[PDB]
């Protein structure tokens, strides 16, 4: 039975190295594994002058360390069949590896070597400079991301969260070997990092290999101190980037979310499951349970739409994004906001009942493999300061009911000034005022 | 015995749409269910219905009817739509019932 399978899930072991680093893992019977370090750093930690540094650092992170230059490093990882990957977001960065459990220790050494000893070769930097500049022109053509960037740019205008992860064209054309070094030396530090691992690995052998390559200890009390970031102010507002030459328009709308720590996030996610998502390839078509999806199909309201509950330490974004043809934007928005009002005023037990099952499946599906189980551990620790087992999540998810979804949603959505980002042939979508009114009375 | 059958056949003739060459199903008021059913009819059945109906409208404007020989006989009336229509309604009631639960 489900209930039981949840209990019999191996616990996540966490132990702290005296230098401040935390080591966690979930041991499975798998011959293959994933281990990596999740860092509490990102563009939110950057300032107006080093914006993009963490991303620039992501480009070098793999081009070799001091102990072993480019060619050697790659050749050493490739030849053991290991996969080296990672990313960097607004509040979180990560570098992790997929290899056989057998190589777990050599892996840990490689990791530690990357975060601690990045070569930062002067010649390499000038090369990744042109590369990043191109990835900007490429990403500039991905409306979905251009839209979420804009959403942040305005929702959190005038703050750190208002910045893109990749940074500016200026910052990238001028960032220095120093700034990159400074960033790494300023942010990649034990107390702010977590070495997570999942697969067939002994927590012990892990931590042992940990103490060995993650030695650097702290002297002052400052070094053992995790810095609290200045809060980012949310602003109900809109940014309209219009280009009628674009084939379809993208629209994103959101209100301020509570931030990782808050339990309501469980309800918000349940809420998003009720509205859910859609795309012209969903075979379910006109019979989908999601009312917004049905209308979308019946009236050809959009090419796709998604609900999201993006969390951050002290805040977040709760909203939705859709892609529609120039002449259906207005109706889509209309029904969409309509569904939000339904959430606050007339949610049904049948809806939540189903929303919960979808959510349960979603959380489980997020632990499908070593890399994804590792991502969870790295993230949970860094954000909740511990691991929340599916058995717990389920307990919380099961306590949600209609009454609760209504109160929580009313609390975050009803009569709030939203953040709006629109890109493309958006002439038919219009007036912040009109949209603001869609924020009340079902 | 054959009472229900005597009555039906009687009503059928009293109604008189058979004098226009129409099938009982040709005379149905086109509400939503009926409209859906019609969309499911095979092409040939749909065109035959269309001609029959157009033909009846023309007789109607002329204030004539078909010669007695061409009248649809009670037992030869083909209930071509009733099958589709019953299915359309079955589906509707399923969804209605389900959306309440």
């Amino acid at each position: 039975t489900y209930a039981q399978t949840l209990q019999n899930i191996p616990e996540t072991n966490v132990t702290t190295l005296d230098n401040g680093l935390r080591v966690a893992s979930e041991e499975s019977s798998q011959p293959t594994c994933t281990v990596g370090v999740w860092i509490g750093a990102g563009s939110r930690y950057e300032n107006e002058k080093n914006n993009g540094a963490g991303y620039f650092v992501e480009h070098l992170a793999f081009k070799g360390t001091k102990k072993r230059p480019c060619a050697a490093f790659e050749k050493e990882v490739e030849s053991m069949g290991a996969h080296f990957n990672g990313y960097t977001s607004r509040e979180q960065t990560a570098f992790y590896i997929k290899a056989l459990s057998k190589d777990m220790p050599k892996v840990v050494e490689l990791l530690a070597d990357v975060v601690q000893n990045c070569a930062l070769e002067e010649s390499q930097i000038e090369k990744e400079r042109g590369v990043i500049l191109q990835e900007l022109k490429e990403m500039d053509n991905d409306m979905t991301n251009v839209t979420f960037d804009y959403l942040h740019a305005t929702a959190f205008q005038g703050t750190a969260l208002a910045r893109t992860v990749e940074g500016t064209t200026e910052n990238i054309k001028h960032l220095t070997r120093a700034d990159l070094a400074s960033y790494i030396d300023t942010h990649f530090k034990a107390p702010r990092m977590v070495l997570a691992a999942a697969g067939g690995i002994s927590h012990k052998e892990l931590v042992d290999a940990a103490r060995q390559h993650f030695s650097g200890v702290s002297f002052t009390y400052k070094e053992d101190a995790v810095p609290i970031l200045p809060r980012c102010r949310f602003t109900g507002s809109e940014i309209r980037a219009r280009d009628d030459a674009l084939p379809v328009a993208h629209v994103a709308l959101a209100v301020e979310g509570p931030g990782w720590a808050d339990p309501d996030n469980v309800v918000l996610h349940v809420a998003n499951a009720i509205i859910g998502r859609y795309d012209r390839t969903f075979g379910g078509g006109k019979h989908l349970s999601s009312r917004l999806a049905a209308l979308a199909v019946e009236h050809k309201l959009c090419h796709s739409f998604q609900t999201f509950n993006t969390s951050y330490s002290d805040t977040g974004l709760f909203g939705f994004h859709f892609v529609a043809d120039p002449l259906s934007i207005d109706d889509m928005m209309f029904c969409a906001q309509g569904e939000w009002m339904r959430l606050c005023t007339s949610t049904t037990e049948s809806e939540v009942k189903r929303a919960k099952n979808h959510l349960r499946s979603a959380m489980v599906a997020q632990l499908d493999g070593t890399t994804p189980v590792c991502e969870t551990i790295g993230s949970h620790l860094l954000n909740y300061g511990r691991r929340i087992s599916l058995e717990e999540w389920d307990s919380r998810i099961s306590a949600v009911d209609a009454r609760m979804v209504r109160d929580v949603c009313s609390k975050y959505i009803y009569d709030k000034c939203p953040a709006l980002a629109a890109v493309g042939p958006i002439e038919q979508l219009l007036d912040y005022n009109r949209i603001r009114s869609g924020m009340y009375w079902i | 015995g054959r009472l229900m059958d005597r009555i039906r056949k009687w009503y059928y003739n009293a109604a008189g749409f058979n004098k226009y060459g129409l099938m009982r199903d040709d005379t149905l008021y086109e509400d939503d269910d009926v409209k859906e059913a019609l969309k499911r009819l095979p092409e040939d059945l749909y065109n035959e219905r269309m001609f029959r109906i157009k033909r009846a409208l023309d007789l109607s404007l002329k204030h004539r009817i078909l010669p007695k020989e061409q009248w649809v006989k009670y037992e030869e009336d083909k209930p071509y739509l009733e099958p589709y229509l019953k299915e359309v309604i079955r589906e509707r009631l399923e969804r209605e019932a389900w959306n309440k639960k």
Partner: protein, 271 residues
């Protein structure tokens, strides 16, 4: 065609109010007493009764203040009728005309002009002839001689009765001895039209192919001539009992029998 229908019911009501206030203007005996009889019915409404009435009269009885406001209303309402008529046709054009066989006519449509412009012009002259014949050869056939006498509040005419087109309703009014009940009955006799769309049970639209409904239909028509006739008669035996029979059958036919027979017919078609 629900909306075309409801606006229609509204047109009828407005037309009746128009003719009612119009009739008072010549200020003859039937003008005054008809005004009195009908308006006094509202003093029967609970609590707000007497108020509503003295408000309508602009005093304590039908008098000059009533006449002047009735003229204003009579001048005005016809324009509302014209207005509403536009809405009537607007809803109508959403669907287009229905037809005598009750089946879709998309397979065979013709332009309004010249077919119907001609048919209608012909229809106009065909009706217009009897109209003029009556108005020119028998001008007072339909009017009450009592209206060739100036209104006198100190002389009640023996038989206070309306123009023919209100008789059916007057009969129903008088069928319920009880000021309040009769008023509701009168009101219901016309408001009943708003329920017709909800009492359709037949699987077919028209009555062209529904012989049981057809007789029920003509029964109802005859029912109306009878009420019209009872409406013109004094309130005495046997007109009293006949009157209630007719009033009762009227409502029964529209409320109970039509929907019932329709269902019954559905079974006889094996539906």
């Amino acid at each position: 065609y629900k909306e075309t229908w409801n606006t229609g019911v509204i047109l009828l009501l407005t037309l009746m109010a128009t003719a009612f206030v119009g009739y008072v203007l010549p200020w003859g005996q039937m003008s005054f007493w008809g005004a009195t009889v009908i308006t006094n019915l509202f003093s029967a409404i609970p609590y707000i009764g007497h108020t509503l009435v003295e408000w309508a009269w602009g005093g304590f009885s039908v008098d000059n203040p009533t006449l002047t406001r009735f003229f204003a209303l009579h001048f005005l309402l016809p324009f509302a009728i014209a207005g509403i008529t536009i809405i009537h046709l607007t809803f109508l054009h959403e669907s287009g005309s229905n037809n005598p066989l009750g089946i879709s006519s998309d397979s065979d449509k013709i332009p309004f002009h010249p077919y119907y412009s001609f048919k209608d012009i012909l229809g106009l002259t065909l009706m217009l002839t009897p109209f003029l014949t009556l108005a020119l050869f028998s001008p007072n056939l339909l009017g009450d001689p009592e209206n060739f006498t100036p209104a006198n509040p100190l002389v009640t005419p023996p038989h206070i009765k309306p123009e023919w087109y209100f008789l059916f309703a007057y009969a129903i009014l008088r069928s319920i001895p009880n000021k309040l009940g009769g008023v509701l009955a009168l009101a219901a006799s016309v408001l009943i039209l708003f329920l017709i769309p909800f009492l359709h049970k037949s699987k077919q639209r028209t009555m062209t192919f529904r012989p049981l409904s057809q007789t029920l239909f003509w029964l109802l028509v005859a029912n109306l001539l009878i009420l019209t006739w009872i409406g013109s008669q004094p309130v005495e035996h046997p007109f009293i009992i006949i009157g209630q029979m007719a009033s009762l059958s009227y409502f029964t036919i529209l409320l109970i029998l039509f929907p019932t027979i329709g269902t019954l017919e559905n079974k006889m078609l094996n539906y």
